[PDB]
A paper describes a structure:
The initial construct (HMA6N) of the [name] N-domain was poorly expressed and required the addition of an N-terminal solubility enhancing tag, which lead to a 15-fold increase in expression. A reduction of the protein concentration to 4 mg.mL-1 occasionally led to crystals with a different, more wedge like shape and a different space group (P22121), not showing any more the inter-grown clusters seen initially. These crystals diffracted up to 1.5 Å resolution and contained only two molecules in the AU. Glu709A, in the partially disordered helix α4, points to the solvent and the glutamate of the wild type sequence, when modelled in the structure, clashes with the side chain of Leu705 of the symmetry related chain A*. On the other hand, the side chain of Glu710 points towards the centre of the domain and would clash with Val730 of β6. Several crystal contacts are present between the chains in two axis, while these mutations allowed for a crystal contact in the third axis, between α4 and α4'.
Here, we present two structures of the nucleotide binding domain of [name] and [name], the former at the highest resolution, obtained for any P-type [name] structure.
Author numbering: 606 to 616, 626 to 711, 717 to 734
């Protein structure tokens, strides 16, 4: 019903950094999963990372991407983040079992689980 971030799994970026990078991509989304990332990532005490103007790109049902502080940050299916250059990690998927995957440049950075 109401998606909430429950777990951030990391295989370098911390759990909170992954949330903040993904939220920068997802900042203006109306999609409930993206809004859940944004909510979880709010940090009133931090200099908010922002996507570069005009770089947000999305293919509905597959994922989104933007440049955040000079990094290509992807948020979406495993196929989406691999297509954008991340190398796979079978353990990350197994550790996770909705879910989204996070790529940062050529790195598969994280998986986020929602309940
Ligand atoms: N970061």
């Amino acid at each position: 019903s109401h998606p909430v971030v429950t777990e951030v799994i990391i295989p370098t970026w911390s759990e909170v950094e992954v949330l903040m990078l993904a939220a920068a991509v997802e900042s203006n989304t109306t999609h409930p999963v993206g809004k859940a990332i944004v909510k979880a990532a709010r940090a009133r005490n931090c200099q908010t990372m922002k996507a570069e103007d005009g770089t947000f790109t999305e293919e509905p049902g597959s994922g989104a991407v933007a440049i955040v502080n000079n990094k290509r940050v992807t948020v979406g299916t495993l196929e989406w983040v691999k297509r954008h250059g991340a190398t796979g990690n079978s353990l990350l998927a197994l550790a996770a079992h909705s879910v989204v995957y996070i790529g940062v440049d050529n790195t598969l950075a994280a998986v986020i689980r929602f309940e």
